[PDB]
Amino acid sequence: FQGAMAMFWGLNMKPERKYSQTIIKSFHISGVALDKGQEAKLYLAAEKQEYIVATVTKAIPQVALDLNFSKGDRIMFYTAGDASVSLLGYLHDIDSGS
Amino acid sequence: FQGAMAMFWGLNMKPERKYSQTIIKSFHISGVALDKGQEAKLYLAAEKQEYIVATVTKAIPQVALDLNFSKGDRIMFYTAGDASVSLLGYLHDIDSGS
Amino acid sequence: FQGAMAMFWGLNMKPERKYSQTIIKSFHISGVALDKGQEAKLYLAAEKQEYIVATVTKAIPQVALDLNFSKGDRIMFYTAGDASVSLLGYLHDIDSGS
Amino acid sequence: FQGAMAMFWGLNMKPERKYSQTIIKSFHISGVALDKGQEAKLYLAAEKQEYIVATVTKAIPQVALDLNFSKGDRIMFYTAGDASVSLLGYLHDIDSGS
Amino acid sequence: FQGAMAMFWGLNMKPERKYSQTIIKSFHISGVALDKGQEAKLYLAAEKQEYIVATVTKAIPQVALDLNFSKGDRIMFYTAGDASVSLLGYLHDIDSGS
């Protein structure tokens, strides 16, 4: 099937949602942006630490950011404020045989 | 022929066009920008989910974004508002033999 | 000689120049910026399609963009407006033997 | 376990903290941003040289930057001003057997 | 020692300095930013051509840019104006045996 490696990923956030989600496939998030919304602060709690990964508002309607996770950790993605943001990314499954 | 891997890709959007297109070659989109136009909201419906990937306007005449798709999914690219945007990217066909 | 893979590339554009150039070495353009100039719209005609890859002006004196081409296509790079822009990039010659 | 290669990394800075830390795992920092804070200047002293890697303020509430370190050097990360910034990155452990 | 590949690199520029330097190790520059300074125009003369790679000022206190050089060329890095800028990057020594 040749090397695809990176397959499309997406995450639609609703105003003040918190998704504590485990990772079965390592992936990279590449952007978070709002179409409908006033303010969305994109927080990530991983390693039991609250990381502020992006602040995407009407003023900054799109935060293109380099995010990457591995299937070893269990992270929580949550947005504060009132806005609905769509994240985009790609699952990275790099294979080189053995 | 050596490793090219990433070959050039481009997509010219017209004001309020919706292209529901299948993927036979995995590719990365790297930028969406408008030359002629007032506003273009670049939406992507993949996995049956409306993702707002970029908002490119006269105010933000160019959104350089990290987009990547695989030949497994069937996505729809569509712009809202009135503007004509040109996306640019590269088809990633990484080969490492077997 | 070890793996260099990506070797330096550069392109100095003069106000309203059009270079229809073939590709013998696949390369990535990573930025277009103006030092002297008022406005430069960086267009790329490839696949016989006019792509607006960047709009770099005095207001936006530098457009860092992810561009990539392969030695299979023959593209034309041309800037509109009055400004002299310097593009920067790197030829990607990835080798992995056979 | 397949190729994960890049595993998630994060760094929460407090206003005017200096962490002189050794590297046992090579990693890339991809963003530094403030949620709470007025100003944070992100300095890095490596090779016994003070590098100003990013200036992230209330005005620029998020600096997405391409940082990369190797397990050979011993660096110091320190922020000046009053703000608490969260850095995000990923440890790059690329393996290709032998 | 596993694959480090990319090792940390940095370059502190003083107001109006010109470093004509040869490359013994291929590297990528990822950002140029000023902490102390009014204006720094980051020029690169390579292939005997003056490239304006970034314009980093008090207004634009940090230019995150994708720069890459190979150990084959001999380049000159020089900043104009009055400001002291710190560049950051990583030497890319990709090895895959033979």
Query: Token pair 């790197």 is at which residue?
Result: C90
Binding-site residues on chain E for chain D (CB distance < 8 A): 2-8, 10, 12, 30-31, 33-35, 61-62, 64, 66, 86, 88, 90, 96-97
Residues 6+ apart with CB under 8 A from B81: B15, B16, B37, B38, B39, B40, B41, B57
Distance CA D39, CA D83 (A): 5
Instruction: List, edge to edge, every strand of the sheet that includes A18-22.
Output: A18-22, A74-80, A39-46, A49-57
Q: Quote the minimal CA–CA distance from A8 to chain D in Å.
A: 17
Contact D2 A47 (CB under 8 A): no
Contact D55 E35 (CB under 8 A): yes
CA-wise closest residue to C44 among C16, C19, C15: C19
CA C58 to chain centre: 19
Q: Number of helices (H) and strands (E) in chain C: give both, helices first.
A: 0, 9
Q: Which residues, in sequence order, are bridge partners of residue D91? A: D7, D27
Binding-site residues on chain B for chain A (CB distance < 8 A): 26, 28, 41, 43-44, 46-47, 49-55, 60, 63-73, 75, 92-96, 98
Chains E and B touch (3+ CB pairs under 8 A): no
Distance CA B5, CA D40 (A): 40
Q: Quote the minimal CA–CA distance from D29 to chain A in Å.
A: 9
Cβ-based contacts of C8 with chain E (< 8 Å): 46-47, 68-70, 73, 75
* CB neighbourhood size of A2 (10 A): 11
Extract the tokens encoding C53: 């890859």
What dihedral angle (degrees, nearest 10) is formed by the CA atoms of C10, C15, C21, C27? Answer: 30
Experimental approach was NMR
Chains touching chain A at 3 or more Cβ pairs under 8 angstroms? B, D
Distance CA B56, CA B41 (A): 6
Q: Quote the minimal CA–CA distance from D32 to chain A in Å.
A: 8
Extract the tokens encoding D10: 């994060």
Instruction: Pick the residue from chain D with its C-alpha nearest to A66.
Output: D30
What dihedral angle (degrees, nearest 10) is formed by the CA atoms of A91, A92, A93, A97? Answer: 170
Q: Quote the minimal CA–CA distance from B26 to chain A in Å.
A: 7
SS3 B25: coil
The CA R_g of chain B, rounded to the nearest whole Å, is: 14
Residues 6+ apart with CB under 8 A from A72: A23, D4, D7
Distance CA E90, CA E29 (A): 6
Q: Quote the minimal CA–CA distance from E69 to chain C in Å.
A: 5
Distance CA D44, CA D63 (A): 15
The CA R_g of chain A, rounded to the nearest whole Å, is: 14
Contact D31 A64 (CB under 8 A): no
Handedness of CA C55, B62, C66, C52 (dihedral sign): negative
Q: Domain A1-98 class?
A: mainly beta
Q: How far from B6 is each of B58, B90, C30, C71, CA to CA, in Å?
A: 30, 5, 15, 10
Chains touching chain C at 3 or more Cβ pairs under 8 angstroms? B, E
Binding-site residues on chain D for chain A (CB distance < 8 A): 2-8, 10, 12, 30-31, 33-35, 61-62, 64, 66, 86, 88, 90, 96-97
* CB neighbourhood size of C80 (10 A): 17
Contact A72 D4 (CB under 8 A): yes
Residues 6+ apart with CB under 8 A from B88: B8, B9, B10, B11, B29, B30, B31, B32, B33, C44, C51, C53, C65, C67
Contact B93 A5 (CB under 8 A): no
How would you label B28-52 residue by residue, b for 16+ Cβ within 10 Å and e otherwise? bbbbbbbbebebbbbbbbbeeeebb
Distance CA C76, CA C42 (A): 10
Q: How far from D56 is each of B47, B67, D42, E11, CA to CA, in Å?
A: 36, 26, 7, 20
DSSP type of residue A1: -
Distance CA B8, CA B3 (A): 14
Q: Which residues, in sequence order, are bridge partners of residue C31? A: C88
Q: Which residues, in sequence order, are bridge partners of residue E17? A: none
User: Which of C10, C64, C96 shows the shortest C-beta gap to E49?
Assistant: C10
Cβ-based contacts of E71 with chain C (< 8 Å): 4
User: Which of A49, A52, A75 shows the shortest C-beta gap to D35?
Assistant: A52
Extract the tokens encoding A27: 């992936």
Count of alpha carbons within 13 Å of E64, Cβ hemisphere only? 16
Binding-site residues on chain C for chain E (CB distance < 8 A): 2-8, 10, 12, 30-31, 33-35, 61-62, 64, 66, 86, 88, 90, 96-97
The phi-psi region of residue B35 (left if phi > 0; otherwise alpha if psi is between -120 and 50; otherwise beta) is: alpha
The phi-psi region of residue C48 (left if phi > 0; otherwise alpha if psi is between -120 and 50; otherwise beta) is: left
Q: Quote the minimal CA–CA distance from B62 to chain C in Å.
A: 7
Handedness of CA C33, C36, C39, C43 (dihedral sign): negative
Cβ(E46)–Cβ(E75) below 8 Å: yes
User: Which of D8, D64, D88 shows the shortest C-beta gap to A70?
Assistant: D8
DSSP string for residues in E68-90: EE-TTSEEEEEEESSEEEEEEEE
Phi, psi values for residue E66, rounded to 5°: -95, 100
Extract the tokens encoding A10: 């997406």
Distance CA C98, CA C76 (A): 33
Distance CA C69, CA C48 (A): 14
Phi, psi values for residue C37, rounded to 5°: 150, 165
Cβ(D85)–Cβ(D16) below 8 Å: no
Cβ(C23)–Cβ(C71) below 8 Å: yes
How would you label E56-94 residue by residue, b for 16+ Cβ within 10 Å and e otherwise? bbeeebbbbbbbbbbbeeebebbbbbebbbbbbbbbbbb
Distance CA D55, CA E63 (A): 11
Q: How far from E14 is each of C45, D74, E24, CA to CA, in Å?
A: 40, 24, 23
SS3 D14: coil
Strands C18-22 and D6-12 turn out to be unpaired
Distance CA E27, CA E66 (A): 11
Q: Quote the minimal CA–CA distance from D1 to chain A in Å.
A: 10
Contact A33 B55 (CB under 8 A): yes
What dihedral angle (degrees, nearest 10) is formed by the CA atoms of C90, C14, E51, E49? Answer: 90
Distance CA B8, CA C68 (A): 6
Chains D and B touch (3+ CB pairs under 8 A): no
**Strand boundaries in chain D, DSSP class E:** 6-12, 18-22, 27-37, 39-46, 49-57, 62-63, 67-69, 74-80, 83-92
User: Which of E3, E4, E64 shows the shortest C-beta gap to D65?
Assistant: E64
Cβ(B48)–Cβ(B95) below 8 Å: no
Phi, psi values for residue A75, rounded to 5°: -110, 160
Extract the tokens encoding B4: 């090219």
CA-wise closest residue to A95 among A5, A2, A27, A23: A5
